[PDB]
Tab-separated table of C-alpha atoms in Angstrom:
chain	number	residue	atom	x	y	z
D	1	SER	CA	97.090	108.597	96.017
D	2	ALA	CA	94.549	107.206	97.737
D	3	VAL	CA	90.357	106.389	98.570
D	4	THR	CA	87.781	106.676	100.452
D	5	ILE	CA	86.709	102.810	101.073
D	6	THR	CA	83.056	102.413	102.431
D	7	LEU	CA	82.701	99.918	104.974
D	8	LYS	CA	79.550	98.808	106.261
D	9	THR	CA	78.951	96.278	109.584
D	10	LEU	CA	76.267	92.863	109.536
D	11	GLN	CA	75.682	94.963	113.200
D	12	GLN	CA	74.566	97.889	110.921
D	13	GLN	CA	76.649	100.826	111.460
D	14	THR	CA	79.135	101.659	108.568
D	15	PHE	CA	81.496	104.313	108.044
D	16	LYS	CA	84.129	105.296	105.617
D	17	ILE	CA	87.354	104.523	105.547
D	18	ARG	CA	90.606	105.425	103.210
D	19	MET	CA	93.848	103.827	102.792
D	20	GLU	CA	95.543	102.991	99.637
D	21	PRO	CA	93.795	101.876	95.986
D	22	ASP	CA	96.394	98.548	96.313
D	23	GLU	CA	96.993	97.924	99.646
D	24	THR	CA	95.995	93.985	100.559
D	25	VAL	CA	92.727	93.487	102.094
D	26	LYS	CA	94.614	91.347	105.117
D	27	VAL	CA	95.413	95.152	105.883
D	28	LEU	CA	92.134	96.026	104.899
D	29	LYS	CA	90.991	93.620	106.863
D	30	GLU	CA	92.991	95.187	110.500
D	31	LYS	CA	91.140	98.180	108.993
D	32	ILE	CA	88.646	97.174	110.360
D	33	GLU	CA	90.114	95.861	113.827
D	34	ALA	CA	91.581	99.553	114.010
D	35	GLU	CA	88.577	101.425	112.215
D	36	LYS	CA	85.782	99.785	114.043
D	37	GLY	CA	87.577	99.049	117.091
D	38	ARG	CA	88.498	95.763	119.338
D	39	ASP	CA	85.704	95.734	121.418
D	40	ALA	CA	83.230	92.524	118.972
D	41	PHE	CA	85.269	92.822	115.426
D	42	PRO	CA	87.962	90.193	115.562
D	43	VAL	CA	89.586	89.201	111.867
D	44	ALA	CA	88.738	84.796	111.707
D	45	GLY	CA	84.491	86.031	110.717
D	46	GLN	CA	86.447	88.738	108.977
D	47	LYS	CA	84.418	88.376	105.452
D	48	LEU	CA	84.406	92.221	103.174
D	49	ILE	CA	80.544	91.353	102.012
D	50	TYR	CA	80.963	93.669	98.494
D	51	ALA	CA	78.677	92.103	96.226
D	52	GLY	CA	77.083	88.949	97.431
D	53	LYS	CA	80.411	87.041	98.018
D	54	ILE	CA	82.784	87.898	100.834
D	55	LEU	CA	85.975	89.608	99.376
D	56	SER	CA	88.803	87.951	100.523
D	57	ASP	CA	92.171	89.358	102.665
D	58	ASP	CA	94.805	87.915	100.375
D	59	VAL	CA	94.009	90.599	97.566
D	60	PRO	CA	94.651	94.629	97.044
D	61	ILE	CA	91.243	96.947	97.687
D	62	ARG	CA	92.001	97.947	94.620
D	63	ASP	CA	91.596	93.983	92.853
D	64	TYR	CA	87.406	93.977	93.279
D	65	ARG	CA	87.187	96.869	91.672
D	66	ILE	CA	84.772	98.731	94.653
D	67	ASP	CA	83.225	102.453	94.647
D	68	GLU	CA	82.092	104.613	97.583
D	69	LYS	CA	78.921	104.912	95.989
D	70	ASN	CA	78.267	101.539	97.422
D	71	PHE	CA	79.660	99.924	100.923
D	72	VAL	CA	80.623	96.752	102.234
D	73	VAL	CA	79.122	94.843	104.671
D	74	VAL	CA	82.245	93.542	105.768
D	75	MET	CA	81.082	90.092	108.785
D	76	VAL	CA	82.540	89.664	111.835
D	77	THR	CA	82.002	86.964	113.542
D	78	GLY	CA	139.188	81.681	67.912
D	79	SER	CA	140.851	82.316	64.884
D	80	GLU	CA	139.468	86.224	63.776
D	81	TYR	CA	141.506	86.823	66.610
D	82	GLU	CA	144.576	84.819	65.809
D	83	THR	CA	143.969	86.102	62.454
D	84	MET	CA	144.411	89.573	64.172
D	85	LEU	CA	146.931	88.779	66.005
D	86	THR	CA	149.554	88.603	63.268
D	87	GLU	CA	147.951	92.004	62.278
D	88	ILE	CA	149.023	93.739	65.678
D	89	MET	CA	152.262	91.890	66.887
D	90	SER	CA	153.462	91.997	63.318
D	91	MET	CA	154.497	95.241	64.370
D	92	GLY	CA	157.039	93.484	66.667
D	93	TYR	CA	154.849	93.305	69.729
D	94	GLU	CA	154.436	89.105	71.217
D	95	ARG	CA	151.999	87.140	70.965
D	96	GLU	CA	150.029	86.987	74.025
D	97	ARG	CA	150.989	90.192	74.862
D	98	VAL	CA	148.734	91.695	71.918
D	99	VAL	CA	145.502	89.746	72.462
D	100	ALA	CA	145.478	90.579	76.350
D	101	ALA	CA	145.658	94.199	74.571
D	102	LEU	CA	143.062	93.087	72.310
D	103	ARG	CA	140.767	91.699	74.427
D	104	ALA	CA	140.672	95.461	76.144
D	105	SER	CA	141.337	97.154	73.375
D	106	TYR	CA	138.377	96.714	70.954
D	107	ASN	CA	140.415	93.874	69.675
D	108	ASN	CA	142.019	95.919	67.518
D	109	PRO	CA	144.914	97.683	66.028
D	110	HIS	CA	143.792	100.807	67.773
D	111	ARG	CA	143.650	100.739	71.240
D	112	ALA	CA	145.372	97.334	71.944
D	113	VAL	CA	149.004	99.382	69.472
D	114	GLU	CA	148.174	101.924	72.689
D	115	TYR	CA	147.608	98.873	75.251
D	116	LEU	CA	150.669	97.355	73.669
D	117	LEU	CA	153.594	99.926	74.018
D	118	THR	CA	152.390	99.279	77.503
D	119	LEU	CA	112.688	95.289	76.116
D	120	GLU	CA	115.946	96.786	74.745
D	121	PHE	CA	117.878	95.834	77.560
D	122	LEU	CA	117.580	92.768	76.469
D	123	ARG	CA	116.926	92.064	73.093
D	124	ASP	CA	120.359	93.540	73.155
D	125	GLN	CA	122.135	91.103	75.836
D	126	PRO	CA	123.661	88.383	75.057
D	127	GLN	CA	121.200	85.639	75.605
D	128	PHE	CA	117.862	87.544	73.304
D	129	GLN	CA	120.623	87.036	70.863
D	130	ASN	CA	121.003	83.091	71.341
D	131	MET	CA	117.069	83.088	71.637
D	132	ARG	CA	117.446	85.913	67.695
D	133	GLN	CA	120.041	83.617	66.215
D	134	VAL	CA	119.991	80.387	66.834
D	135	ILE	CA	116.101	80.324	66.107
D	136	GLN	CA	116.520	80.881	63.456
D	137	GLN	CA	117.808	77.952	62.096
D	138	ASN	CA	115.545	76.007	65.371
D	139	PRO	CA	112.026	76.937	66.098
D	140	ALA	CA	112.188	74.371	68.803
D	141	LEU	CA	114.702	76.289	70.968
D	142	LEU	CA	112.463	79.830	71.277
D	143	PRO	CA	109.579	78.402	72.950
D	144	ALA	CA	112.744	76.268	74.581
D	145	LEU	CA	114.770	79.380	75.452
D	146	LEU	CA	111.928	81.706	76.728
D	147	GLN	CA	110.873	79.211	79.198
D	148	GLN	CA	114.714	78.212	80.193
D	149	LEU	CA	117.056	81.823	78.953
D	150	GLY	CA	113.784	84.152	78.277
D	151	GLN	CA	112.166	82.776	81.750
D	152	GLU	CA	115.524	84.363	84.157
D	153	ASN	CA	114.807	87.584	83.257
D	154	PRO	CA	112.174	89.197	84.918
D	155	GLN	CA	112.438	92.598	83.828
D	156	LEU	CA	110.991	91.241	80.194
D	157	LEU	CA	109.013	88.649	81.616
D	158	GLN	CA	106.848	91.182	83.031
D	159	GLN	CA	106.180	92.673	79.691
D	160	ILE	CA	106.512	90.038	77.078
D	161	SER	CA	103.838	87.719	78.559
D	162	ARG	CA	101.769	90.540	77.126
D	163	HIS	CA	103.792	91.651	74.973
D	164	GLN	CA	104.453	88.200	73.532
D	165	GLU	CA	103.379	89.892	69.681
D	166	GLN	CA	106.057	92.830	70.122
D	167	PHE	CA	109.100	90.159	71.695
D	168	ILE	CA	108.307	87.770	67.951
D	169	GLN	CA	107.596	90.589	66.237
D	170	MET	CA	111.421	92.357	66.540
D	171	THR	CA	90.977	121.345	41.901
D	172	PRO	CA	89.007	121.915	38.122
D	173	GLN	CA	92.620	124.205	36.749
D	174	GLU	CA	95.583	121.894	38.283
D	175	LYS	CA	93.457	118.398	37.303
D	176	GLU	CA	94.052	119.439	33.576
D	177	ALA	CA	97.920	119.108	34.052
D	178	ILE	CA	97.182	115.432	35.737
D	179	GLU	CA	94.340	114.061	33.776
D	180	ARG	CA	96.788	114.657	30.813
D	181	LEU	CA	100.201	113.302	32.353
D	182	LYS	CA	97.649	110.169	33.621
D	183	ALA	CA	97.177	109.601	30.037
D	184	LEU	CA	100.081	110.263	28.770
D	185	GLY	CA	101.503	107.169	29.759
D	186	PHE	CA	102.568	108.393	33.590
D	187	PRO	CA	100.764	107.481	36.991
D	188	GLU	CA	98.941	108.927	39.215
D	189	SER	CA	99.996	110.131	42.644
D	190	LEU	CA	103.684	110.605	41.484
D	191	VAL	CA	102.152	112.671	38.924
D	192	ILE	CA	98.749	114.704	40.491
D	193	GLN	CA	101.088	115.734	43.167
D	194	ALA	CA	104.937	116.142	41.800
D	195	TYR	CA	103.340	118.623	40.012
D	196	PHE	CA	103.808	121.579	42.035
D	197	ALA	CA	107.482	120.961	41.626
D	198	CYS	CA	108.836	124.651	41.051
D	199	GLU	CA	106.388	127.184	39.396
D	200	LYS	CA	103.288	124.811	38.374
D	201	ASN	CA	104.688	124.373	35.324
D	202	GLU	CA	104.908	121.120	33.150
D	203	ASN	CA	108.765	120.123	33.398
D	204	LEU	CA	110.009	121.471	36.486
D	205	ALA	CA	107.943	117.899	37.488
D	206	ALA	CA	107.889	116.730	34.520
D	207	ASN	CA	111.093	117.998	32.991
D	208	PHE	CA	113.175	116.422	36.209
D	209	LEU	CA	110.604	113.056	36.155
D	210	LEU	CA	111.679	112.167	32.824
D	211	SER	CA	115.500	113.223	33.711
D	212	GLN	CA	115.654	111.233	36.770
D	213	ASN	CA	112.898	108.271	36.065
D	214	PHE	CA	113.967	107.851	31.994
């Protein structure tokens, strides 16, 4: 996953490097020190001229969108749980033992009685739930959280920045049977279509349309 980059030097000596279409130009600058050598190609005056201005060395070589067709003149100069406690405890178990099992047994009489004898990753997380449950009564929390809670998970921040819209959003023969039905009082799309009910007859489609609707 590569790309030959043509590098021209003010000395009128060009060549063709390749590196990767992403390597920070900082490494590309060093690439010129090894590509041409270090006899007179330092770094202090390393400016990658590609279009009048010199390309910096802190951005990826694929940030300027260079083209092999051109060379670069580089420079080098709570309760519901208790109501449940009685729902299960009543069987005979104790009280604290019931909630304990109701904490690891789906707080239900199912596993409890058993433990009583002896964009999507965030939309489902508790963080987003507070942003989609509290915002229902406070539109000011959306931004407050988007900068606090929503600004804590980089997994969504990388998308939400560009997905803020989705994040917030979350024939002349059959015509005779239609012209008549559409004229009898029935609609059109549901009539011209439903007509193909069973045998293109006037009841399979209508008969079932009059008994199911009227």
